JSON list of C-alpha atoms in Angstrom, two decimals:
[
{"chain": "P", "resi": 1, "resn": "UNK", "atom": "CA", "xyz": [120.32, 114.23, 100.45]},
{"chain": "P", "resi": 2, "resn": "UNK", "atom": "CA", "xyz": [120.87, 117.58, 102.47]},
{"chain": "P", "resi": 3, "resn": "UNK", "atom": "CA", "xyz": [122.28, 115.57, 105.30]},
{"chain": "P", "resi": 4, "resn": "UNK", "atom": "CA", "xyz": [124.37, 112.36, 105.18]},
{"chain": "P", "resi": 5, "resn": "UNK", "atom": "CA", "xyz": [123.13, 108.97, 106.03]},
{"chain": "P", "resi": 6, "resn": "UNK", "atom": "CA", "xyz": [123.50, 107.50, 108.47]},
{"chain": "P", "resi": 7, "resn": "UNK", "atom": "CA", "xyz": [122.85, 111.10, 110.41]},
{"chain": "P", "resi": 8, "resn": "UNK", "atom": "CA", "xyz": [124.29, 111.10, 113.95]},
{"chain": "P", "resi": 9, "resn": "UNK", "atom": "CA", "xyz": [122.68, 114.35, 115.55]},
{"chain": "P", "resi": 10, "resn": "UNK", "atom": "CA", "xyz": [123.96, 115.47, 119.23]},
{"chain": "P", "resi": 11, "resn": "UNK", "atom": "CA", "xyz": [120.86, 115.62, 120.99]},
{"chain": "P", "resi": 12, "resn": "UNK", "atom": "CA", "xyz": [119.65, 117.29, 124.58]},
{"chain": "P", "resi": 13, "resn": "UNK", "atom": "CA", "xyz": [116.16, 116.10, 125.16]},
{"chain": "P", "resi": 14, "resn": "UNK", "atom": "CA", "xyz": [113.19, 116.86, 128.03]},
{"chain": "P", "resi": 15, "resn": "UNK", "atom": "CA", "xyz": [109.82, 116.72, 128.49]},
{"chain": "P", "resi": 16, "resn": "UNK", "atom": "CA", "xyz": [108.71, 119.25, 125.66]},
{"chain": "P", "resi": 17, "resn": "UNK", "atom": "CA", "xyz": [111.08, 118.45, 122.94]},
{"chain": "P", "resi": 18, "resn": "UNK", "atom": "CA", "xyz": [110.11, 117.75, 119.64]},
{"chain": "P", "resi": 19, "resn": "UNK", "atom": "CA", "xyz": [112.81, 116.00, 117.11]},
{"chain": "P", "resi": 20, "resn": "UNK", "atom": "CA", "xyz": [111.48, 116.51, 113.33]},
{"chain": "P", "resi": 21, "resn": "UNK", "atom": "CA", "xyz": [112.66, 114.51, 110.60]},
{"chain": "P", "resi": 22, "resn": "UNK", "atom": "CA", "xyz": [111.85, 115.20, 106.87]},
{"chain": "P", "resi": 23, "resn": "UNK", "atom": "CA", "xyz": [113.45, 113.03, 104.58]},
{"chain": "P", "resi": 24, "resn": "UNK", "atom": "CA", "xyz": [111.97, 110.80, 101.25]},
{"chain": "P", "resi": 25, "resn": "UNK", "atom": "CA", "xyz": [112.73, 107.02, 100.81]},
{"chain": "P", "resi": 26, "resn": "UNK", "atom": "CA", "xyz": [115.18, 106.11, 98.07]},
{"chain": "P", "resi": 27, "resn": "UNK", "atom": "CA", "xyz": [113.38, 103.06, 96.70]},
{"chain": "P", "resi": 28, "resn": "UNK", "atom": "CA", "xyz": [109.56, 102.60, 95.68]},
{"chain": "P", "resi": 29, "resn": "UNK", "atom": "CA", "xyz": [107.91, 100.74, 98.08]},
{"chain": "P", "resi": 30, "resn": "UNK", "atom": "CA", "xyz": [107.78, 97.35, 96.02]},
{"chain": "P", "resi": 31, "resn": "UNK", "atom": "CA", "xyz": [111.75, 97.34, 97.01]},
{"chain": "P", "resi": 32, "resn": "UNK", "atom": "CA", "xyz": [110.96, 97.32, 100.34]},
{"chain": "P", "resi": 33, "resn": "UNK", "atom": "CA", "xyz": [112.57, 100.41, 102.18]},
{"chain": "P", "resi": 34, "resn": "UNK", "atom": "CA", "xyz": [113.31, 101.12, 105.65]},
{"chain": "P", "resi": 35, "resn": "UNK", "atom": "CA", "xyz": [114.22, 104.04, 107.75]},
{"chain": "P", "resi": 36, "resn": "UNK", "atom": "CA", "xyz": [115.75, 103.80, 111.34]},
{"chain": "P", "resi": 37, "resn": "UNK", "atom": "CA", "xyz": [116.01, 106.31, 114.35]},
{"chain": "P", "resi": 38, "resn": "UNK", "atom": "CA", "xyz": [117.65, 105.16, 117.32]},
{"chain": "P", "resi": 39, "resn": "UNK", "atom": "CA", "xyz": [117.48, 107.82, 120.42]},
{"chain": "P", "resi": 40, "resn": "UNK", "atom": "CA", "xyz": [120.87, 106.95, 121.70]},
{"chain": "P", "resi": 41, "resn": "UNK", "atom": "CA", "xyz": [122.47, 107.33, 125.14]},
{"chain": "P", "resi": 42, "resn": "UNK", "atom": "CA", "xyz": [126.01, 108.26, 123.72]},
{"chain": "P", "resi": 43, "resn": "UNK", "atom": "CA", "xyz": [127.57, 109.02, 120.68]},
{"chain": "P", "resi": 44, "resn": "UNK", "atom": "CA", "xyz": [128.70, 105.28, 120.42]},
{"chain": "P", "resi": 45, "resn": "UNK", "atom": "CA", "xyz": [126.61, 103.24, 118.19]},
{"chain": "P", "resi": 46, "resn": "UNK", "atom": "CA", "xyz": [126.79, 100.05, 120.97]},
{"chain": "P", "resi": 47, "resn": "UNK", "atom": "CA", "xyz": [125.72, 101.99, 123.74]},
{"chain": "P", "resi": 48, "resn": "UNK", "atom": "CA", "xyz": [122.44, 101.67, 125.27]},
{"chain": "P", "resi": 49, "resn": "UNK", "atom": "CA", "xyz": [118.70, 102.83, 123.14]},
{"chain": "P", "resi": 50, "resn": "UNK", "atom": "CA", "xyz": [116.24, 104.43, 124.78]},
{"chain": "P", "resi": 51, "resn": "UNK", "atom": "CA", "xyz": [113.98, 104.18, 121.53]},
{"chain": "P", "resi": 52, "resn": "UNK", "atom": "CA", "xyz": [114.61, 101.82, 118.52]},
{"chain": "P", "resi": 53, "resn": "UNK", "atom": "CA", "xyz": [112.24, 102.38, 115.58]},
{"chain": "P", "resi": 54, "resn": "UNK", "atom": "CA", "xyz": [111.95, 100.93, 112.79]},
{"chain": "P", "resi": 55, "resn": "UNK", "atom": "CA", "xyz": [109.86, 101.44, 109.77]},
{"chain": "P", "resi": 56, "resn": "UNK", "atom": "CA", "xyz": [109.07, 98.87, 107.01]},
{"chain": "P", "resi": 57, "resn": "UNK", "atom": "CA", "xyz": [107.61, 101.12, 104.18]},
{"chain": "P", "resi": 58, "resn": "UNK", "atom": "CA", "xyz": [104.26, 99.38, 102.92]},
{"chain": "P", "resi": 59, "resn": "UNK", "atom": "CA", "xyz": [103.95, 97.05, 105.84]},
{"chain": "P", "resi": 60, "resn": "UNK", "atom": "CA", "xyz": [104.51, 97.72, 109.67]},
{"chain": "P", "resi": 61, "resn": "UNK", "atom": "CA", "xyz": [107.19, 99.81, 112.47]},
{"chain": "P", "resi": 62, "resn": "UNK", "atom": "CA", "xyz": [108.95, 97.93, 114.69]},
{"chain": "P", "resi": 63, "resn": "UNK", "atom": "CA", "xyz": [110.05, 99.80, 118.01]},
{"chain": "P", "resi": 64, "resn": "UNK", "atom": "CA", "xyz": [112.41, 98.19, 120.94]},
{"chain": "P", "resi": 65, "resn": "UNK", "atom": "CA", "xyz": [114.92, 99.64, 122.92]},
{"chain": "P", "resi": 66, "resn": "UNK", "atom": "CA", "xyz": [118.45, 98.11, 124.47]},
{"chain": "P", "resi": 67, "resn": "UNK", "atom": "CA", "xyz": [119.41, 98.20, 128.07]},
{"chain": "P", "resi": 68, "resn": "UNK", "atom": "CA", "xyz": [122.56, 97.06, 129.24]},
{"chain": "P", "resi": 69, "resn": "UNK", "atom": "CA", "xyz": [123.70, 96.24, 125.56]},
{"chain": "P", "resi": 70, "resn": "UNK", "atom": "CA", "xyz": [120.41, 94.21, 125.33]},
{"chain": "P", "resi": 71, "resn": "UNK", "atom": "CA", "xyz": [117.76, 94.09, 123.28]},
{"chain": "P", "resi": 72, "resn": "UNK", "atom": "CA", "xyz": [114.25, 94.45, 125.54]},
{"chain": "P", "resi": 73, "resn": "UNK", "atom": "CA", "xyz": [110.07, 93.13, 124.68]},
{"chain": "P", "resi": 74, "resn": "UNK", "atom": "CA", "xyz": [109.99, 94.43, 120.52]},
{"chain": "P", "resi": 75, "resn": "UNK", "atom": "CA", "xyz": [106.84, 96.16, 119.99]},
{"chain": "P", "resi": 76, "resn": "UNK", "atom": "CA", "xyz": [105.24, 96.67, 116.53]},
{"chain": "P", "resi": 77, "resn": "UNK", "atom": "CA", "xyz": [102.59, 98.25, 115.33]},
{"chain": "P", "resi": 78, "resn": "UNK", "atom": "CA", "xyz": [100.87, 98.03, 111.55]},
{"chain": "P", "resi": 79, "resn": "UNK", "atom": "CA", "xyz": [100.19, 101.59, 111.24]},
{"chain": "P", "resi": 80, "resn": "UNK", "atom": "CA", "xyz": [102.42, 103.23, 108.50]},
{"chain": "P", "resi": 81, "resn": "UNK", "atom": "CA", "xyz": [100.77, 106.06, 107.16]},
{"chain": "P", "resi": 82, "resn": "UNK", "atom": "CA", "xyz": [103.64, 107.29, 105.02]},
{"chain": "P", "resi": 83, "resn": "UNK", "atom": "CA", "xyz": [103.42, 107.39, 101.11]},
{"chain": "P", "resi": 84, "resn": "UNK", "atom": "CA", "xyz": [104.94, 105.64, 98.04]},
{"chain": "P", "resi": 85, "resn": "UNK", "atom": "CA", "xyz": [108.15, 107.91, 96.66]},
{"chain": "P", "resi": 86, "resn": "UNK", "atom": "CA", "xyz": [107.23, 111.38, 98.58]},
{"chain": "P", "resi": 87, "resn": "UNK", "atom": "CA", "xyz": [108.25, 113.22, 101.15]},
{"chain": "P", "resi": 88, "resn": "UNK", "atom": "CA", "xyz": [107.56, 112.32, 105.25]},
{"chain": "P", "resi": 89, "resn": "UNK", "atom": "CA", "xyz": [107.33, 114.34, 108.12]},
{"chain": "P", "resi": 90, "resn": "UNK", "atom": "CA", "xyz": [108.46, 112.71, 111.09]},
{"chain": "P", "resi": 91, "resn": "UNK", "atom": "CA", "xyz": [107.80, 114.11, 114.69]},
{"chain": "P", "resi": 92, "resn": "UNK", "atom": "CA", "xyz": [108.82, 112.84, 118.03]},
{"chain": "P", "resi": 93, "resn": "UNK", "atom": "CA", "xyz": [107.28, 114.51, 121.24]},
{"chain": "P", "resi": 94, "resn": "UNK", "atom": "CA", "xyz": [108.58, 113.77, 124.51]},
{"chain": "P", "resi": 95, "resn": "UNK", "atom": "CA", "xyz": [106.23, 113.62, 127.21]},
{"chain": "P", "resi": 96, "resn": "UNK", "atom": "CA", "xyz": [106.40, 113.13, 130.34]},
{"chain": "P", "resi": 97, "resn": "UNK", "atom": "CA", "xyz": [105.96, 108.74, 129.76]},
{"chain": "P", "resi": 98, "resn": "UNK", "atom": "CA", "xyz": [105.97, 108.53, 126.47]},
{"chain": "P", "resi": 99, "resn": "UNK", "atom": "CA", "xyz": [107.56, 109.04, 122.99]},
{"chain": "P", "resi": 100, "resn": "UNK", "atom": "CA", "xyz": [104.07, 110.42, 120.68]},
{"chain": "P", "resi": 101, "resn": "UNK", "atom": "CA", "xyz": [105.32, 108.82, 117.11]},
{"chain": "P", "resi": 102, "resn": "UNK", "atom": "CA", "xyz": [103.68, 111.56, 114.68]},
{"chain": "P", "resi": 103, "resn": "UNK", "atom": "CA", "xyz": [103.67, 110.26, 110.60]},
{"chain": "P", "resi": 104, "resn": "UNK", "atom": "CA", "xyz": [102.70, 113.24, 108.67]},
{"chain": "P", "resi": 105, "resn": "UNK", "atom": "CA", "xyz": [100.57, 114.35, 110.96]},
{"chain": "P", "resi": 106, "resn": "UNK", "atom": "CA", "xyz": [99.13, 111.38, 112.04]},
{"chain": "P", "resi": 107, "resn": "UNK", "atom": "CA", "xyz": [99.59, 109.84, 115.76]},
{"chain": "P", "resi": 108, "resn": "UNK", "atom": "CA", "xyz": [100.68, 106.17, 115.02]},
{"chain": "P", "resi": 109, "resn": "UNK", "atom": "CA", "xyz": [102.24, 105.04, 118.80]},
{"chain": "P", "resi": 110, "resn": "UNK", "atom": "CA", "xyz": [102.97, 106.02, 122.41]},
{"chain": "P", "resi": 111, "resn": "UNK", "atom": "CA", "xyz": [106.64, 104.35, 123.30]},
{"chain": "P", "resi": 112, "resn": "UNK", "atom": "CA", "xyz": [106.41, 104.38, 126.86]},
{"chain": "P", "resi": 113, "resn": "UNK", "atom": "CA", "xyz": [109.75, 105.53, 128.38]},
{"chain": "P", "resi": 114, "resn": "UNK", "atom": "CA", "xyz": [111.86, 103.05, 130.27]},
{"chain": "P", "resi": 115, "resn": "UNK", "atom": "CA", "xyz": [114.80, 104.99, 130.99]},
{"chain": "P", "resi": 116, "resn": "UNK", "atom": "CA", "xyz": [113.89, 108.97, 131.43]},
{"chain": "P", "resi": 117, "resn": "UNK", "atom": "CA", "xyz": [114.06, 111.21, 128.14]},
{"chain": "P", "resi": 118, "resn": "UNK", "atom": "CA", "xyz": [116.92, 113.35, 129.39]},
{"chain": "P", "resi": 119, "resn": "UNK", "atom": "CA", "xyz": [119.64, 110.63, 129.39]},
{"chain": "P", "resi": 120, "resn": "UNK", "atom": "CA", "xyz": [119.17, 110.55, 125.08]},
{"chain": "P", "resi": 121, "resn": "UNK", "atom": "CA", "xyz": [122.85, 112.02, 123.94]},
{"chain": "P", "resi": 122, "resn": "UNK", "atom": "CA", "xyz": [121.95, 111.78, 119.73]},
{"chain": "P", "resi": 123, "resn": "UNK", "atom": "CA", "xyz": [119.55, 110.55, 117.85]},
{"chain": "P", "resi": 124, "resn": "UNK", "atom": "CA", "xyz": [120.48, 108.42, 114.58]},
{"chain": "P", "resi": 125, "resn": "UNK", "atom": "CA", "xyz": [118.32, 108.86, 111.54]},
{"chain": "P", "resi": 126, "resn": "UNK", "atom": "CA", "xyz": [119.46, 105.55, 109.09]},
{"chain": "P", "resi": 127, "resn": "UNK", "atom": "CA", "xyz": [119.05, 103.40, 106.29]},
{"chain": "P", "resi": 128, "resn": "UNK", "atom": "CA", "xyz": [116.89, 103.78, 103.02]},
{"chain": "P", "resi": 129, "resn": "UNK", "atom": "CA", "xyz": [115.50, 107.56, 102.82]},
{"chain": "P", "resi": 130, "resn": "UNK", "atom": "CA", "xyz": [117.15, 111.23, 101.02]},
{"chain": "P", "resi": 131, "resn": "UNK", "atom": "CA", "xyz": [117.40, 113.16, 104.37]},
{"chain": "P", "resi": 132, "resn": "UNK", "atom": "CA", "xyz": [115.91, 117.00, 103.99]},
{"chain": "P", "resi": 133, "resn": "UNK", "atom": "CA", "xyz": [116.12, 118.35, 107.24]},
{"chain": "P", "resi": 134, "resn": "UNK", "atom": "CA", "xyz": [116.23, 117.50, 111.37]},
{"chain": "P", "resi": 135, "resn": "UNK", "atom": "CA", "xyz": [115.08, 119.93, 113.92]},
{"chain": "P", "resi": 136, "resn": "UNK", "atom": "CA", "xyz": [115.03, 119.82, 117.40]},
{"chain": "P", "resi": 137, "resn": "UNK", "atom": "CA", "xyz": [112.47, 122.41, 118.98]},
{"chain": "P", "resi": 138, "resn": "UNK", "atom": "CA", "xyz": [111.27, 123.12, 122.41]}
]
């Protein structure tokens, strides 16, 4: 992996941004693989999530987010368009309500934004994927 894993990238997000994530999952899909991002308000791995989400290769995301150190409504959706053993492209636009979830390409989700975009500090990238590169663009 380029980067290490769990990646902790400082972060200064607004309406605009884009955070891109390229990385490839370390086990075959039949091994069940995940990969986590967590848009976090502070370096601190207990402080508060503006965006939770995670994927279960093969089988379904599940997004949430943590307010006062507690887990909100989880929201899931089965869309998973990524592929067995190859690389992923994975872009997060911040509009003005809502994170766009972009897989390859491919719109899966709107995450509707409960706490305003500019108050994410890093954003984690986690668990079972090679990481290649993360961008932030504007």
């Amino acid at each position: 992996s380029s980067l290490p894993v769990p990646y902790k990238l400082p972060v200064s997000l607004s309406v605009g941004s884009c955070v891109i994530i390229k990385g490839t999952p370390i086990h075959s899909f039949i091994n069940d693989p995940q990969l986590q991002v967590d848009f976090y308000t502070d370096m601190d791995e207990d402080s508060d999530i503006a965006f939770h989400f995670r994927v279960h290769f093969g089988n379904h995301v599940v997004m949430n987010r943590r307010e006062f150190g507690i887990w909100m409504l989880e929201e899931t959706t089965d869309y998973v368009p990524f592929e067995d053993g190859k690389q992923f492209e994975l872009c997060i636009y911040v509009h003005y309500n809502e994170y766009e979830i972009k897989v390859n390409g491919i719109r899966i989700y709107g995450f509707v934004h409960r706490i305003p975009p500019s108050f994410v500090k890093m954003v984690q990238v986690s668990r079972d994927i090679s990481l290649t590169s993360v961008c932030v663009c504007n």
